[PDB]
Design a protein around this motif. Structure first.
Motif, mmCIF file in Angstrom:
data_model
loop_
_atom_site.group_PDB
_atom_site.id
_atom_site.type_symbol
_atom_site.label_atom_id
_atom_site.label_comp_id
_atom_site.label_asym_id
_atom_site.label_seq_id
_atom_site.Cartn_x
_atom_site.Cartn_y
_atom_site.Cartn_z
ATOM 1 N N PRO A 92 11.522 -21.107 25.258
ATOM 2 C CA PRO A 92 12.104 -21.342 23.927
ATOM 3 C C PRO A 92 11.671 -20.260 22.950
ATOM 4 C CG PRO A 92 10.300 -22.860 24.328
ATOM 5 C CD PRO A 92 10.518 -22.122 25.617
ATOM 6 N N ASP A 93 12.647 -19.534 22.415
ATOM 7 C CA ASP A 93 12.397 -18.423 21.507
ATOM 8 C C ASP A 93 12.679 -18.855 20.074
ATOM 9 O OD1 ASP A 93 11.790 -15.910 20.532
ATOM 10 O OD2 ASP A 93 13.785 -15.090 20.941
ATOM 11 N N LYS A 94 11.690 -18.674 19.201
ATOM 12 C CA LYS A 94 11.811 -19.006 17.790
ATOM 13 C C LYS A 94 11.442 -17.783 16.965
ATOM 14 C CE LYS A 94 10.312 -23.739 18.810
ATOM 15 N NZ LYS A 94 11.719 -24.221 18.894
ATOM 16 N N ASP A 95 12.274 -17.467 15.971
ATOM 17 C CA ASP A 95 12.059 -16.356 15.045
ATOM 18 C C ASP A 95 12.097 -14.995 15.739
ATOM 19 O OD1 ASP A 95 11.927 -15.806 12.332
ATOM 20 O OD2 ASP A 95 9.743 -15.576 12.328
ATOM 21 N N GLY A 96 12.657 -14.929 16.946
ATOM 22 C CA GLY A 96 12.834 -13.663 17.633
ATOM 23 C C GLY A 96 11.552 -12.933 17.981
ATOM 24 N N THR A 97 10.583 -13.650 18.558
ATOM 25 C CA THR A 97 9.307 -13.029 18.906
ATOM 26 C C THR A 97 9.479 -11.938 19.957
ATOM 27 O OG1 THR A 97 8.802 -14.653 20.624
ATOM 28 C CG2 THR A 97 8.159 -15.192 18.364
ATOM 29 N N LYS A 98 10.340 -12.175 20.953
ATOM 30 C CA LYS A 98 10.591 -11.246 22.054
ATOM 31 C C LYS A 98 9.331 -11.020 22.886
ATOM 32 C CE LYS A 98 14.724 -10.193 21.100
ATOM 33 N NZ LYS A 98 15.800 -11.001 21.736
ATOM 34 N N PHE A 99 9.432 -10.223 23.949
ATOM 35 C CA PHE A 99 8.308 -10.035 24.856
ATOM 36 C C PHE A 99 8.346 -8.628 25.433
ATOM 37 C CE2 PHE A 99 8.924 -14.674 25.005
ATOM 38 C CZ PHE A 99 7.665 -15.061 24.596
ATOM 39 N N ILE A 100 7.168 -8.119 25.805
ATOM 40 C CA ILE A 100 7.007 -6.740 26.255
ATOM 41 C C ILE A 100 6.528 -6.672 27.706
ATOM 42 C CG2 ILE A 100 5.326 -4.873 26.067
ATOM 43 C CD1 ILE A 100 7.903 -6.023 23.496
ATOM 44 N N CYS A 101 5.458 -7.402 28.038
ATOM 45 C CA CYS A 101 4.991 -7.521 29.417
ATOM 46 C C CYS A 101 4.683 -8.973 29.751
ATOM 47 C CB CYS A 101 3.734 -6.686 29.719
ATOM 48 S SG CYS A 101 3.515 -5.150 28.822
ATOM 49 N N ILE A 102 4.694 -9.271 31.052
ATOM 50 C CA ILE A 102 4.328 -10.584 31.568
ATOM 51 C C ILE A 102 3.401 -10.412 32.764
ATOM 52 C CG2 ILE A 102 6.516 -11.587 30.801
ATOM 53 C CD1 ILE A 102 7.415 -11.667 33.683
ATOM 54 N N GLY A 103 2.699 -11.493 33.100
ATOM 55 C CA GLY A 103 1.763 -11.501 34.203
ATOM 56 C C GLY A 103 1.767 -12.847 34.897
ATOM 57 N N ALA A 104 1.015 -12.930 35.990
ATOM 58 C CA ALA A 104 0.952 -14.131 36.811
ATOM 59 C C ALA A 104 -0.490 -14.592 36.961
ATOM 60 C CB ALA A 104 1.568 -13.891 38.193
ATOM 61 N N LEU A 105 -0.675 -15.910 37.023
ATOM 62 C CA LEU A 105 -1.986 -16.527 37.166
ATOM 63 C C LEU A 105 -1.834 -17.819 37.958
ATOM 64 C CD1 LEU A 105 -4.283 -16.386 33.993
ATOM 65 C CD2 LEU A 105 -4.198 -14.884 35.962
ATOM 66 N N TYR A 106 -2.960 -18.338 38.452
ATOM 67 C CA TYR A 106 -2.950 -19.706 38.959
ATOM 68 C C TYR A 106 -2.744 -20.700 37.826
ATOM 69 C CZ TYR A 106 -3.765 -22.737 43.004
ATOM 70 O OH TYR A 106 -3.611 -23.612 44.054
ATOM 71 N N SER A 107 -3.004 -20.285 36.589
ATOM 72 C CA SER A 107 -2.542 -21.003 35.414
ATOM 73 C C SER A 107 -1.100 -20.662 35.076
ATOM 74 C CB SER A 107 -3.449 -20.704 34.219
ATOM 75 O OG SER A 107 -2.880 -19.707 33.388
ATOM 76 N N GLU A 108 -0.348 -20.192 36.073
ATOM 77 C CA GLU A 108 1.053 -19.804 35.954
ATOM 78 C C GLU A 108 1.231 -18.591 35.053
ATOM 79 O OE1 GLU A 108 4.262 -19.595 36.478
ATOM 80 O OE2 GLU A 108 3.624 -20.336 38.442
ATOM 81 N N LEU A 109 2.438 -18.419 34.522
ATOM 82 C CA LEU A 109 2.828 -17.163 33.904
ATOM 83 C C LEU A 109 2.030 -16.893 32.631
ATOM 84 C CD1 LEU A 109 5.080 -17.605 31.254
ATOM 85 C CD2 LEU A 109 6.118 -18.857 33.153
ATOM 86 N N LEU A 110 2.029 -15.624 32.243
ATOM 87 C CA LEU A 110 1.343 -15.123 31.064
ATOM 88 C C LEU A 110 2.266 -14.134 30.369
ATOM 89 C CD1 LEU A 110 -2.364 -14.099 30.819
ATOM 90 C CD2 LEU A 110 -0.609 -12.509 30.064
ATOM 91 N N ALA A 111 2.266 -14.144 29.039
ATOM 92 C CA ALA A 111 3.243 -13.382 28.275
ATOM 93 C C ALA A 111 2.571 -12.609 27.151
ATOM 94 C CB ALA A 111 4.334 -14.294 27.697
ATOM 95 N N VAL A 112 3.243 -11.541 26.721
ATOM 96 C CA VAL A 112 2.824 -10.730 25.585
ATOM 97 C C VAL A 112 4.033 -10.499 24.691
ATOM 98 C CG1 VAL A 112 2.103 -8.444 24.843
ATOM 99 C CG2 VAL A 112 0.867 -9.607 26.685
ATOM 100 N N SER A 113 3.882 -10.793 23.402
ATOM 101 C CA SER A 113 4.974 -10.665 22.451
ATOM 102 C C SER A 113 5.073 -9.229 21.940
ATOM 103 C CB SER A 113 4.786 -11.643 21.294
ATOM 104 O OG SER A 113 4.119 -11.025 20.207
ATOM 105 N N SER A 114 6.078 -8.985 21.094
ATOM 106 C CA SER A 114 6.293 -7.641 20.568
ATOM 107 C C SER A 114 5.145 -7.203 19.670
ATOM 108 C CB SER A 114 7.617 -7.587 19.806
ATOM 109 O OG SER A 114 8.621 -8.316 20.486
ATOM 110 N N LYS A 115 4.750 -8.051 18.720
ATOM 111 C CA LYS A 115 3.677 -7.702 17.799
ATOM 112 C C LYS A 115 2.302 -7.759 18.450
ATOM 113 C CE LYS A 115 6.260 -11.067 15.092
ATOM 114 N NZ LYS A 115 6.117 -12.244 14.191
ATOM 115 N N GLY A 116 2.199 -8.348 19.636
ATOM 116 C CA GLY A 116 0.928 -8.484 20.315
ATOM 117 C C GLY A 116 0.366 -9.878 20.144
#
Length: 600
Positions: A92-116
């Motif tokens: 769910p995207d709110k206010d257009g955060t967007k994303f730059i990189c993603i990663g994987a964990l046993y805690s499932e996915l991990l994300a990084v937004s545009s502003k950091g």
């Protein structure tokens, strides 16, 4: 536009099995041409930028900054084999955060937004993490990490470890929540190092144990040291003095793809021999299994220190550029180039020097390709084999001969791969008495949809003829010069253009869709490509291009015993060379260039 495919490779195995699985998916794509899967259809329509395979799920990061997630499972008795969920849930995207990189964990996915900003999900939660005490707070460990006041630009992760680099050259590394027992000795908050100073971190990669960073001209390693150096150091300590470890030892291991933290009951007396551990469930923190000591690690109360905290540089030759790096259990693997001569190197953390150096059997110019930025290396880290990606974007097979070298690659006929992802996944709900392999690696493939070249590889005369006819109509419309340029520069594995594909599919199979019908259709496609008006100005470019073996389409036809194809290409070359208007250029010069180019 691309297509998504799934393969699964039993983890304990040879590179030949990976190559066989890749051949199988290529054959399914080409020989069978089955229908696509509706659930992933939307995901195919957009340009994927990254992919991560979790333990049970999968996550894809798109150019538009809109991530998705889908689950998967494997049917054990059939070893697409991977069974997917009915529907996929988006982010769910709110206010257009967007994303730059993603990663994987046993805690499932991990994300990084545009502003950091360090967003993530988990298996147990079906909603993005939120904080009631603070709407702007996510990933509470980030408060421990201190990344809440930084712009995250580089991110990497694997089964347990996750590393982040911000604009300020600050490296922040941590482990999964299951490793909180050892998190004191395996974590560093945001900080800048003098060794990393003076240059911008080009890339950074992680693993189950340690982490590498690729700079402008240097490579650095930090984290847990491998077992061989551990044993060298322990033997040195033992010889200095002249029961390796006492009982009641808390340790953790990532064997079988699951990071488990247990306690050691019996004091270790044999280093190679496996020893039993008692599992420590997280609920008890808030079951006896014999684990091998080859892949384990123990937290130390205070013997020389095992963990290496300060990153150290690994030697690379003089005036050499690095094209791609990735990290596995065996060390760090890279592809290097100086002048025009490209090598594949495996760096053991033992010596810090070139433990293994191999020269590609094919030409270096073909490997570099049109774009040198598409070279990449893929390895899960623990047991998955290496997947290479050359300049053109296709996949370079990697098999070892009976010596220390790379076998003459056998081509998969696989189109360029936009996104490749791979994930360790241990099969469960299976009998323990069975001798079948437990874990495996799930590989997801995003192959580009090259229309004409896939048509040629299919030996499909009808689709090729229709494509060329509509192309000539569009050329008459004078609106698809871009399409002409696009389908002219299209390449397949080994720097092979459409003419090389026609020649390769024209090869004989056995002495005398039917195979004879396939060869006949290939011959018709070759004739159509040679004589058609539209590719008249470009045919000289196509016939003068070189395969990975420095081989023109005529050269390949002669070498592959496609003699009628060779005669066709020869007469076409004569016709084109004669028809070409001489502008400070000769007849024999261009004819030799398209038959046997100088320098061969």
């Amino acid at each position: 536009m691309t297509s998504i495919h799934f393969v699964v490779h039993p983890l304990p195995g040879t590179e030949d099995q990976l190559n066989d699985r890749l051949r199988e998916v290529s054959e399914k794509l080409n020989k069978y041409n089955l229908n696509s899967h509706p659930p992933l259809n939307v995901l195919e329509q957009a340009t994927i930028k990254q992919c991560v395979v979790g333990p049970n799920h999968a996550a894809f990061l798109l150019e538009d900054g809109r991530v998705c997630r889908i689950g998967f499972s494997v049917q054990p008795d059939r070893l697409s084999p991977v069974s997917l969920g009915e529907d996929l849930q988006w982010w769910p995207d709110k206010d257009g955060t967007k994303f730059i990189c993603i990663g994987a964990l046993y805690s499932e996915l991990l994300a990084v937004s545009s502003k950091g900003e360090l967003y993530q999900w988990k298996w147990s939660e079906s909603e993005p993490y939120r904080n009631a005490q603070n709407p702007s707070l996510h990933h509470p460990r980030a408060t421990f990490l201190g990344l809440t006041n930084e712009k995250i630009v580089l991110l990497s992760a694997n089964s347990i470890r996750a590393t982040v680099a911000t604009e300020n050259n600050k490296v922040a590394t941590w482990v999964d929540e299951t490793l909180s027992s050892v998190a004191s000795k395996l974590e560093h908050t945001a900080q800048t190092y003098s060794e990393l100073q003076g240059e911008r971190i080009v890339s950074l990669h992680c693993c189950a144990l340690y982490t590498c960073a690729q700079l402008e001209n240097s490579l650095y390693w930090w984290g847990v040291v491998p077992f061989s150096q551990r044993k060298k150091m322990l033997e040195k300590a033992r010889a200095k003095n002249k029961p390796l470890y006492h009982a009641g030892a808390v340790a953790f291991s990532i064997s079988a793809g699951i990071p488990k933290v247990g306690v050691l009951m019996e004091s270790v007396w044999n280093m190679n021999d496996s020893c039993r551990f008692q599992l420590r469930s997280p609920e008890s923190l808030k079951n006896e299994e014999q684990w091998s000591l080859r892949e384990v690690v123990f937290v130390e109360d205070v013997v020389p220190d095992c963990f290496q905290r300060t990153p150290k540089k690994l030697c690379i030759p003089e005036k050499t550029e690095i094209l791609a790096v990735n990290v596995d259990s065996k060390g760090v693997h890279a592809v290097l180039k100086t002048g025009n001569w490209v090598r594949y190197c495996i760096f053991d953390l033992a010596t810090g020097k070139a433990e293994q150096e191999n020269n590609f059997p094919t030409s270096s110019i073909a490997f570099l390709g049109q774009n040198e930025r598409n070279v990449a290396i893929f390895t899960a880290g623990q047991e998955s084999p290496i997947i290479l990606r050359d300049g053109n974007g296709t996949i370079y097979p990697m098999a070892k001969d009976c010596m220390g070298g790379i076998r003459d690659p056998d081509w998969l006929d696989l189109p360029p791969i936009s996104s490749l992802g791979m994930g360790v996944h241990s099969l469960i709900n299976l009998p323990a008495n069975s001798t079948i392999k437990k874990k495996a690696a799930v590989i997801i493939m995003a192959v580009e949809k090259q229309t004409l070249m896939q048509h040629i590889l299919r030996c499909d005369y009808e689709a090729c003829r229709q494509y060329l006819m509509n192309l000539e109509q569009a050329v008459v419309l004078e609106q698809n010069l871009q399409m002409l340029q696009t389908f002219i520069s299209h390449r397949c594995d080994g720097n092979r253009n459409i003419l090389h594909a026609c020649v390769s599919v024209c090869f004989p199979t056995s002495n005398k869709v039917e195979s004879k019908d396939r060869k006949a259709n290939a011959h018709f496609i070759l004739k159509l490509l040679c004589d058609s008006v539209v590719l008249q100005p470009y045919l000289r470019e196509l016939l003068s291009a070189k395969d990975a073996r420095g081989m023109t389409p005529f050269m390949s036809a002669v070498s592959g015993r496609a003699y009628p194809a060779a005669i066709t290409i020869l007469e076409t070359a004569q016709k084109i060379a004669k028809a070409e208007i001489s502008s400070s250029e000769k007849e024999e010069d261009v004819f030799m260039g398209m038959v046997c180019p100088s320098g061969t």
